[PDB]
Amino acid sequence: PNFSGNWKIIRSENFEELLKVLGVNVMLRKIAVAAASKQAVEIKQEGDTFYIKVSTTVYTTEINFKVGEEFEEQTVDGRPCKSLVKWESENKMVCEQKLLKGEGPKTSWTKELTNDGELILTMTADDVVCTQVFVRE
Numbered sequence: 001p002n003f004s005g006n007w008k009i010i011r012s013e014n015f016e017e018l019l020k021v022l023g024v025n026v027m028l029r030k031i032a033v034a035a036a037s038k039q040a041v042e043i044k045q046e047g048d049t050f051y052i053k054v055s056t057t058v059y060t061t062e063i064n065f066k067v068g069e070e071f072e073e074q075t076v077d078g079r080p081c082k083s084l085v086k087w088e089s090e091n092k093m094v095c096e097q098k099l100l101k102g103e104g105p106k107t108s109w110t111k112e113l114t115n116d117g118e119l120i121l122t123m124t125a126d127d128v129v130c131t132q133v134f135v136r137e
């Protein structure tokens with residue numbers, strides 16, 4: 001459907017706790033939390049092909065995938081991973097990730113388009129879930 005658009009963040013909850021699980025030290029966590037409040041997301045959706053660009057003040061990353069097809073990206077803490085996105089309903093997808101090297105917490109993310117017009121992103125490390133809410137620019 002209509003994930004396509006330019007999204008700007010309005011809320012970010014439990015991000016510090018997520019980074020803590022992933023081993024990030026406290027000063028860097030606080031700085032990452034501040035960076036997260038400037039997060040912008042650009043999405044182009046065509047059928048089940050997605051192009052996603054996530055940026056902050058000094059960094060930008062692009063994600064390209066097709067639902068049901070494995071691709072490579074990086075975890076929240078920056079480790080390379082194999083990813084696979086599946087639909088959970090009309091406007092929610094869930095991505096499971098697997099580390100390319102070594103071991104770590106089990107990570108994943110979801111994106112959901114609500115009926116209120118919000119884009120909800122969740123990111124998970126084991127027990128800890130970060131939720132971020134976006135609205136259209």
Ligand SMILES: *C/C=C(C)/C=C/C=C(C)/C=C/C1=C(C)CCCC1(C)C
Binds near residue numbers: 063075109111
């Ligand atoms: C589908 C949406 C995805 C995969 C969004 C991914 C977003 C990130 C991996 C964001 C990472 C950030 C940091 C690692 C610190 C700076 C703040 C963020 C939230 C941009």
